[PDB]
């Protein structure tokens, strides 16, 4: 029967970015994992081709296009990514979720005194719960950060205003809800109870509803969205995940896995981009991109089962069982950073010494307090370079060449060779495309210049047989060679280019818009940009995100060179390869939220592993084969 | 296999509007036809419940920046993405070319192939590209084409894009097929295919430059269907409202084949229909009834088509109804003389339309029926046009308001309570501050008043035991009696109420927002308003739209009373029961567009059937068993 015959998503002739005219056959209503080194093409295929085309086909039906030849059997795509859900100064976990609305309804139906409908409990409307002084923003002495008017806070259920309810952990909110007895609101209590418990089940019990949406990690944002999908009655949709193990402790990966398979078993296609073998191995189907990155990847080098992947001899197949060992010895501290009475968030008046001149890895379950400790007590101090995953400013107008400073010497080399002025090859050129400069105008290729960025007057000027648009289109790795010798020789470009290669970004194009970078990409770009000296204490939050096990060895060499040239490196991680490479571990716990906030271990990795006393130590001991 | 098990859309506890806690099980990837008399509840179930809930679940996944209340239903399981293929407009600067892929692809073809070169695809667009600066793309400079001189200078084989856009799609497809240039082999195939699909669906007579706002509901629906038939989306629920609208008897089978084509792509197809020739292709039937309004709202049959035939429901009993020709016809009392009619495709038509009788104007879509009637008759004295078009300010109106009865009712409420009429009006200070109409912004129930319309002190004032809120909630058929005798008696309301009953609108509520009326219902509403008044000739464009075969019998009694009281009734129709009942038929043809525009028959239905010499006659002959 024809109507029941469309059980595969079929791709033919896919060419977005580096993809080499690839083809795949993805089984609908199954979990497919997309593997391969970073820059191999995984997001080009899953996000910029499959999901982008589903989204365009949906968009074209509303009243109000990727490069690929055939895309057959597509369904609606919902992106469950690591982008924030709303970023306004008025978006919280509660405003982004059914929870917050249900809670406002409960309060309009049960709090005393009566004050109105659900909207009297909301800070994103006035006349309305909004505090009039801060306009529901909260930065504010009149509402003490709660965002609500005195009236909105006066209406209470058993002693609790909605501000109190929103301030507690969701695990505590859930218990508060379960203890409410009142026959008027029974179904509402059941419905709110079940959403809250679902937060608890995915492991977000430590968050509060009042948490500002922009302070969530990429992984927390993604998991908050997942609560909605897991509760949704939609079926036959394609849910698309970007590394859903990000921000999860080793103890918590199996729980994420079961969530992904539960989504599938609801009758949905689940597409996951992952590097972690513990998630790869749950797949019904595998698509492996490679062989390597950029112009050296973009091919489907394996497609089949997980057992087929193991036997395939691809770069992913060959590393799938790679598991680090501990160092034979650790470095000796050249000093101490004294942390005294750390009490941000859940931290239980923490005293700890962090060793200088070594690689310290800060570990513990999500919500345990790692970032609260490190950001709160170390980040503000002098000489301390925080390199994180946050967006870069003016990203629409910038690219890796501009952000790092290499573009200027390149423009000088073009100008000197061709008898013209530097500025002719800039965003403010006479010859710049009127409608972009960036070659794109969310981001699609600018039609006026075709992506070339400049009018043909500027493009006639060449160095090494290449115009300036061809240069912007080069990967860092190719540019590293292009600018090394001959007419184009440009030593100050070479300097930055080698650093970008060394942090693992050899695949990025010099002109790639910065808004297309992942958080781990942004962080490695910044890392490269700070390399060259300036300060002596580097803080890196989860620098392995987006890295295949091949790539992590290279980051670990880079961190070793950093420490050995006399710097302190402090890394917050769940990646056990990084843990295994540490000189010193500080483990937070025991659990998340008020079950955590304490240093449960401080010591060498070998002592951690010998004890097996903490969740981190237990997992790490299994990981190193102990 | 749990993932493959969600193969039914399951509705339990549906209570929107008149629905009586209904339940159905709709098979995915099958065609389900929803049948029943007008007002039985079909659209309540299909559009306000099934499709609305799919759309809500999709919308809640969109970011807050991007951005619908749950219908009244208990469980709605197995839902997929839903796309409405309704008779709503697509409009302006909006043409069939701008609304379709065809237009975009045409512009691209011209940018690649046309000489002289003038630019990229947007140099050929009239949304500053190709736009005529004098009229701003809307004219002595561009002669109505909307395009600058430069835009029109660019030629392929002598034709500009204005010429290609002015032609019928059917001639454009042949032209496109005639072009041979290796540069664009692939675009000619893609363009030629989308154009062929316009031809196949029967819209070959349209031109790409036809303004979107001037399409009929049927044409608009078929333009949308071209896009769906070409879409690679699968596992979508496509929801159609009466897709036989505006189709000639000859063209029904082709629309059936396209609906089944859409299913066979791997999609659920939901269709609301009254035409037996389409009903009988269904995989599954859901029949609403027994009758309309409070007498409906139940699922009175669900199952197979053969089941429907045996069922004894109203639908089942009428499935095989074929009207017969009248044994005699009325004699004209005069003639409307049409001379030289040359609107659109009309070939200088001379025709006499008889006065004092029921004339039915027939012929294939695009033959020129509306060009003739609208261009040559609708101008004249004592001619009332009663069409399906939207009514002014419908957002703030309802049947009670539109017909003038709401003010007499407020006076009745005022006198009987020693208050004044304005307390009960939209400009009252007791009216809900954010509505009056009991919904906001499409149409959702208002939170402030909870759908009540007025504060609870206004609803203290009653007549016949009913507050004003309850009066707005009443069906016409109940209002008619409640206002006929007793302490709420209001004669002026009864007069209007009875008129509404007689045009088949007994099920409408008095406060029903006018934006919820279908095209047919608006037409019949306007007809009730005109029936008192002064005209002697009435023009009705497709008044069977939205009518079950049971409701069409009651329409024909009404039309017979209209004519028998001395009025001329001219009806444009494809419904063969109406043609069989006529005094006189004017048939346009032979075909559509430049193959149409001539009167190919004029005479009694009997003489049409005996000649059996046009498409309409051949079909009417088969319809009456000749
Ligand atoms: N939006 C884009 N514009 C230009 N080049 C891009 C863009 N996105 C990715 N690339 C490049 O395409 C290649 C593959 O990238 P991606 O598919 O992001 O890899 P992965 O997801 O496997 O890390 C890389 O060389 C990358 O720099
Ligand atoms: N901006 C914030 N506002 C309020 N509470 C926060 C904020 N950031 C973190 N928390 C809370 O502090 C506790 C520790 O979280 P965090 O330091 O982010 O843990 P980790 O970094 O180990 O995952 C958690 O219970 C978390 O919900
Ligand atoms: N949006 C609405 N608000 C109030 N009443 C409505 C609305 N839509 C339909 N109705 C009423 O509900 C009943 C069911 O109508 P509907 O589902 O439109 O019937 P059908 O689609 O079978 O013609 C009718 O009595 C109608 O007047
Ligand atoms: N507004 C318009 N602008 C240009 N052409 C039109 C317009 N309305 C109709 N036509 C053309 O006139 C011809 C007859 O159309 P129409 O009168 O609407 O036929 P019918 O009413 O029989 O379906 C068709 O080829 C159609 O494309
Ligand atoms: Cl940190
Ligand atoms: Cl620069
Ligand atoms: Cl038939
Ligand atoms: Cl009957
Ligand atoms: Cl009053
Ligand atoms: Mg990417
Ligand atoms: Mg309706
Ligand atoms: Zn405030
Ligand atoms: Zn440009
Ligand atoms: Zn003009
Ligand atoms: Zn209101």
Residue numbers in the entry:
A (entry chain B): 15 to 78, 89 to 151, 173 to 184, 296 to 597, 608 to 792
B (entry chain A): 15 to 81, 87 to 110, 113 to 148, 172 to 182, 296 to 598, 608 to 792
What did the paper state?
We have determined the structure of Ecm16 bound to adenosine diphosphate (ADP) at 2.0 Å resolution. Our final model consists of the Ecm16 homodimer, four ADP, two Mg2+, four Zn2+, and 612 water molecules. Some residues, including 183-293 of chain A and 185-295 of chain B that includes the entire insertion domain, were not modelled due to missing electron density. Each protomer of Ecm16 contains two ABC ATPase motifs, referred to as nucleotide-binding domain I and II (NBD-I and NBD-II). The dimer interface of Ecm16 buries ~ 3900 Å2 of surface area and is comprised of residues from the ATP-binding I, signature I, and signature II domains. The ventral side of Ecm16 features an extended groove that is lined with numerous basic residues (K136, K143, K381, R384, R567, K568, R537, K549, K572, K577). This ~ 10 nm long and ~ 2 nm wide groove can potentially accommodate a ~ 32 bp B-form DNA and provides a structural basis for the previously reported DNA-binding activity of Ecm1614. Ecm16 has a total of four nucleotide-binding sites, two proximal and two distal nucleotide-binding sites. Electron density at both the proximal and distal nucleotide-binding sites showed the presence of ADP. Mg2+ ions are observed only at the two proximal nucleotide-binding sites, and not at the distal sites, even though Ecm16 was crystallized in the presence of 10 mM MgCl2.
